[PDB]
Write an enzyme that holds these catalytic residues in place. Structure first.
Site, short mmCIF file in Angstrom:
data_model
loop_
_atom_site.label_atom_id
_atom_site.label_comp_id
_atom_site.label_asym_id
_atom_site.label_seq_id
_atom_site.Cartn_x
_atom_site.Cartn_y
_atom_site.Cartn_z
N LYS A 43 56.63 32.08 27.14
CA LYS A 43 57.24 31.66 28.20
C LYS A 43 56.55 31.58 29.56
O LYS A 43 56.78 30.85 30.28
CB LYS A 43 58.89 32.68 28.37
CG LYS A 43 59.61 32.38 27.18
CD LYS A 43 60.60 33.47 27.24
CE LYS A 43 60.27 34.88 26.72
NZ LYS A 43 59.98 35.22 25.49
N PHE A 84 46.28 39.73 23.85
CA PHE A 84 45.56 40.93 23.38
C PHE A 84 46.24 41.74 22.68
O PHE A 84 46.27 42.15 21.51
CB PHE A 84 44.68 41.58 24.46
CG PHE A 84 44.35 43.04 24.05
CD1 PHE A 84 43.32 43.33 23.36
CD2 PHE A 84 44.86 44.02 24.99
CE1 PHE A 84 43.24 44.56 22.78
CE2 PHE A 84 44.85 45.25 24.95
CZ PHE A 84 43.63 45.72 23.67
N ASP A 89 49.29 43.63 17.88
CA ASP A 89 50.76 44.34 17.24
C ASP A 89 51.17 43.47 16.04
O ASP A 89 51.73 44.08 15.19
CB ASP A 89 51.73 43.85 18.53
CG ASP A 89 53.46 44.24 18.18
OD1 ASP A 89 53.49 45.40 18.16
OD2 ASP A 89 53.99 43.48 17.74
N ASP A 93 52.45 45.36 12.83
CA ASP A 93 53.68 45.07 12.26
C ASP A 93 53.92 44.17 11.05
O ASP A 93 55.17 43.98 10.80
CB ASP A 93 54.31 44.73 13.66
CG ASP A 93 54.55 45.93 14.61
OD1 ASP A 93 54.23 46.95 14.31
OD2 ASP A 93 55.22 45.42 15.55
N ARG A 98 54.41 33.82 15.31
CA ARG A 98 54.32 34.31 16.47
C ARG A 98 54.58 32.71 17.56
O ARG A 98 53.54 32.02 17.35
CB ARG A 98 53.20 34.86 17.05
CG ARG A 98 52.60 34.98 18.53
CD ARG A 98 54.03 35.77 19.17
NE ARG A 98 53.67 37.46 18.74
CZ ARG A 98 54.77 38.50 19.01
NH1 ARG A 98 55.58 38.10 20.08
NH2 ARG A 98 54.46 39.75 18.67
N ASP A 160 55.55 54.15 19.10
CA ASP A 160 56.06 53.17 18.36
C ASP A 160 55.86 53.26 16.70
O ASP A 160 56.88 53.35 16.12
CB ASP A 160 55.80 51.63 18.72
CG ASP A 160 56.64 50.42 18.25
OD1 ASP A 160 55.98 49.86 17.22
OD2 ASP A 160 57.92 50.66 18.44
N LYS A 186 55.62 51.23 25.99
CA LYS A 186 55.11 50.21 25.36
C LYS A 186 55.39 48.72 25.97
O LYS A 186 54.95 47.77 25.52
CB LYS A 186 55.64 50.13 23.77
CG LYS A 186 56.95 49.40 23.51
CD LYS A 186 57.02 49.34 22.12
CE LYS A 186 58.50 48.42 21.82
NZ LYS A 186 58.55 48.79 20.45
N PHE A 225 64.69 44.65 28.71
CA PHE A 225 64.02 43.18 28.05
C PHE A 225 63.60 43.64 26.50
O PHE A 225 63.74 42.82 25.87
CB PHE A 225 62.89 43.07 28.96
CG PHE A 225 62.20 41.76 28.43
CD1 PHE A 225 62.55 40.52 28.77
CD2 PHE A 225 60.93 41.69 27.78
CE1 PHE A 225 62.11 39.21 28.33
CE2 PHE A 225 60.30 40.62 27.63
CZ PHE A 225 60.96 39.37 27.92
N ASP A 229 65.09 42.43 23.20
CA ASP A 229 63.88 41.85 21.95
C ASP A 229 64.35 42.48 20.54
O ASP A 229 64.26 41.83 19.67
CB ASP A 229 62.45 42.26 22.38
CG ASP A 229 61.53 42.11 21.28
OD1 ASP A 229 60.91 40.74 21.23
OD2 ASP A 229 60.97 42.89 20.62
N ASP A 230 64.79 43.73 20.64
CA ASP A 230 65.25 44.20 19.59
C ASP A 230 66.52 43.56 18.84
O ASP A 230 66.60 43.55 17.48
CB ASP A 230 65.48 45.81 19.56
CG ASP A 230 64.37 46.58 20.15
OD1 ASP A 230 63.15 46.25 20.05
OD2 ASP A 230 64.42 47.91 20.34
O1 LIG Z 1 59.28 44.41 18.85
P1 LIG Z 1 57.63 44.65 19.37
O2 LIG Z 1 57.66 46.13 20.25
O3 LIG Z 1 56.81 44.88 18.46
C1 LIG Z 1 57.08 43.24 20.22
O4 LIG Z 1 58.22 43.05 21.33
C2 LIG Z 1 56.01 43.17 20.92
N1 LIG Z 1 55.38 44.12 21.86
C3 LIG Z 1 54.21 45.03 21.98
C4 LIG Z 1 54.43 45.86 22.89
N2 LIG Z 1 55.66 45.59 23.60
C5 LIG Z 1 56.62 44.71 22.61
P2 LIG Z 1 57.27 41.75 19.19
O5 LIG Z 1 58.96 41.62 18.90
O6 LIG Z 1 57.10 40.42 19.87
O7 LIG Z 1 56.44 42.18 17.80
C1 LIG Z 2 57.28 42.59 25.31
C2 LIG Z 2 57.74 41.82 24.26
C3 LIG Z 2 59.12 41.90 23.97
C4 LIG Z 2 56.84 41.07 23.48
C5 LIG Z 2 57.22 39.69 23.63
O1 LIG Z 2 57.26 39.30 25.10
P1 LIG Z 2 57.59 37.64 25.49
O2 LIG Z 2 58.99 37.71 24.81
O3 LIG Z 2 57.70 37.51 27.06
O4 LIG Z 2 56.83 36.53 24.78
P2 LIG Z 2 56.02 35.39 25.35
O5 LIG Z 2 56.85 34.64 26.18
O6 LIG Z 2 54.69 35.95 25.80
O7 LIG Z 2 55.68 34.39 23.73
MG LIG Z 3 55.80 43.77 16.77
MG LIG Z 4 60.46 43.11 18.55
MG LIG Z 5 55.37 46.39 17.43
#
Ligand SMILES: O=P(O)(O)C(O)(Cn1ccnc1)P(=O)(O)O
Ligand SMILES: C=C(C)CCOP(=O)(O)OP(=O)(O)O
Ligand SMILES: [Mg+2]
Ligand SMILES: [Mg+2]
Ligand SMILES: [Mg+2]
Ligand SMILES: O=P(O)(O)C(O)(Cn1ccnc1)P(=O)(O)O
Ligand SMILES: C=C(C)CCOP(=O)(O)OP(=O)(O)O
Ligand SMILES: [Mg+2]
Ligand SMILES: [Mg+2]
Ligand SMILES: [Mg+2]
Lengths: 339, 339
Positions: A43, A84, A89, A93, A98, A160, A186, A225, A229-230
């Site tokens: 994004k 990075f 990550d 995970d 991605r 985490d 994180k 945020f 995401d979760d």
């Molecule tokens: O759920 P996560 O914390 O791993 C994630 O949001 C990535 N991330 C890494 C650090 N904070 C968030 P993603 O869903 O993209 O795998």
């Molecule tokens: C911190 C989190 C939730 C990881 C993904 O961030 P974004 O959801 O902003 O991902 P991109 O737009 O960078 O693909």
């Molecule tokens: Mg992850």
């Molecule tokens: Mg996630």
């Molecule tokens: Mg993770």
């Protein structure tokens, strides 16, 4: 906005590539390939936030070509910090996709070499800062800010991963108190605080109250945020989000399981205990049925409305002397997002 | 010397731990554990070089307690840069032991979480520099120096890994010209240049000629050191070196294979082609027989004598105005080493 920001990327690539020492040519070709796969396709909320906020904080007669170029470049530095972290990550995970393409480490031919690839992306930040901001009074401020953000994010990831052991039951640590710390560290610092803070420093705003105030709003916005995401990990469309979810099978302290645990009967507790944290698809399927059975999508939609109102109340309180538009732009960008 | 240096480590641990925010306590316990496994057990040539050289460059009446403490701490920063890289390196090279204990990532319970562990060790460098050298005129110099060294080493590793694909024959790229670049970048800058250069900056020596001169000697000394390392991979005692070799099975551009290729008959070339770069123990055994059959141990012992003399000639030429003892100490430390 996005199109202009995104189009600067080839200048970014060209400067980091222009380092042809024709002996390291092959590693520089390899780095180009790494920039394009891993920095593109998201994004750009972070990098665009650096640019939008900079324009909003600097008087237009002082927004010359060189200083806007520096703004674009610092925006791309936040995008590289992101890359990075995601590349690493995704490895830790055991993720599959991605941004709607297979995770870099799953590419045949790449493998755990992506570990060096991620470190190389991190190093590009500081080369960029050296090349464009070396002779600026904010140079050290930006450097210390990027390094501190990295450290914070590594602390959070550390928590985490600890809280989500493979092979072991860990429902006893899935508390709200615990969830909040993990996500503060994180996600919230680097995704929300860092980009606005970069722009402030570039506009000459280094007061401690002013930074602490921006931090009050932006950390809360980061918690929100990560919670979104979760929810999308389990309940989002992988063709939309561009990524396959893994939280339940990775034993993670996701917002969902925390909320499940505070609502669950003792028998429901046991279902989660027998089924959470394992690769078996039918066990994951059961956990999700427990979630839907407890109305957690509705629980989330109500949390999302309340949290948003509290965020808007924090903006009213702490935005001054900065324009509210700065924070409203971001908030309204991430609200009700399905991606 | 070593005992005094090594004993400062608990102050290092105590300062990075003193960051108890009791929410991140568990990640700070985890970081302590990571410092102790991964930073301890080696020779300490890098960190001790920072300390020895500092004493040799600063007038004794200016070597107060606080400034010697800063010297110890910058020495430990080079030790952490090392740890960061080795932990990652061991993952990408599928190694088994390090410093006479199993590689951190092979520890049951650790796995690829060690990727974040390595990044966390890197971040500690900059926290240490912030905490002890923030108000010093050399602060930015040290920061840019550590970041540039990291980048250089990631470029070199990138070339190490490219040139050594799993699954593919690559004897055509195993040239001297290629070997020299890889080792310049992946070893010489951070292992030799960085520690002396850190000490110079702390003694107030920032002239470009003075740094370039130290670089002439120290890069050559790094090439030599990696060549020794490549010889010990195959021909060293893993109870002594503390590590099991993997170069042949990882398809690596080791000094040995380069030298094998320039001496080999077409039929010998073919033996290497059918046998190099694979996990099969009997194929590795054959490669080593080809090496011993070409007298490469003797080829190495003669290279080691000649290279050493050239290094001593470079010291005569470029040491001034710095004491030759600075570079002689290091050279004589690594010469004829079996460990
Ligand atoms: O759920 P996560 O914390 O791993 C994630 O949001 C990535 N991330 C890494 C650090 N904070 C968030 P993603 O869903 O993209 O795998
Ligand atoms: C911190 C989190 C939730 C990881 C993904 O961030 P974004 O959801 O902003 O991902 P991109 O737009 O960078 O693909
Ligand atoms: Mg992850
Ligand atoms: Mg996630
Ligand atoms: Mg993770
Ligand atoms: O042989 P490598 O280059 O991997 C090695 O020397 C590590 N290394 C990493 C960067 N430069 C050297 P090690 O033998 O310890 O595995
Ligand atoms: C650059 C190389 C050859 C990696 C190991 O360095 P050392 O051989 O100095 O290892 P430690 O003393 O740090 O264990
Ligand atoms: Mg290696
Ligand atoms: Mg190795
Ligand atoms: Mg080796």
């Amino acid at each position: 906005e996005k199109q202009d920001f995104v189009q600067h990327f080839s200048q970014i690539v060209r400067v980091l590539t222009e380092d042809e020492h024709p002996e390291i040519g092959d590693a520089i070709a390899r780095l180009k390939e790494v920039l394009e796969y891993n920095a593109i396709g998201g994004k750009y909320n972070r990098g665009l936030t650096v640019v939008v906020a900079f324009r909003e904080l600097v008087e237009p007669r002082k927004q010359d070509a060189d200083s806007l170029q520096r703004a674009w470049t610092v925006g791309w530095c936040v995008e590289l910090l992101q890359a990075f972290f995601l590349v690493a990550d995704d490895i830790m995970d055991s993720s599959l996709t991605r941004r709607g393409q297979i995770c870099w480490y799953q590419k045949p031919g790449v493998g755990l070499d992506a570990i060096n690839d991620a470190n190389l992306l991190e190093a590009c930040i500081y080369r960029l800062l050296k090349l464009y901001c070396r002779e600026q009074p904010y140079y050290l401020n930006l450097i210390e800010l990027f390094l501190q953000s990295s450290y914070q994010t590594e602390i959070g990831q550390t928590l985490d991963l600890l809280t989500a052991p493979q092979g072991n039951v860990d429902l006893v640590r899935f508390t709200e108190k615990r969830y909040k710390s993990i996500v503060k560290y994180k996600t919230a610092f680097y995704s929300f605080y860092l980009p606005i803070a970069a722009a402030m420093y570039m506009a000459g705003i280094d007061g401690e109250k002013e930074h602490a105030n921006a931090k009050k709003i932006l950390l809360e916005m980061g918690e929100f945020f990560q919670i979104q995401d979760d929810y999308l990990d389990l309940f989002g469309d992988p063709s939309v989000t561009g990524k396959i979810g893994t939280d339940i099978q990775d034993n993670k302290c996701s917002w969902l399981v925390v909320q499940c645990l505070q609502r669950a009967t003792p028998e429901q507790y046991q279902i989660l205990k027998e089924n959470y944290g394992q690769k078996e698809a039918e066990k994951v399927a059961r956990v999700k049925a427990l979630y839907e059975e407890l109305d957690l999508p509705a629980v989330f939609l109500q949390y999302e409305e309340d949290s948003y109102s509290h965020i808007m109340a924090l903006i009213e309180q702490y935005a001054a002397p900065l324009p509210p538009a700065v924070f409203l732009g971001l908030a309204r960008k991430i609200y009700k997002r399905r991606k």
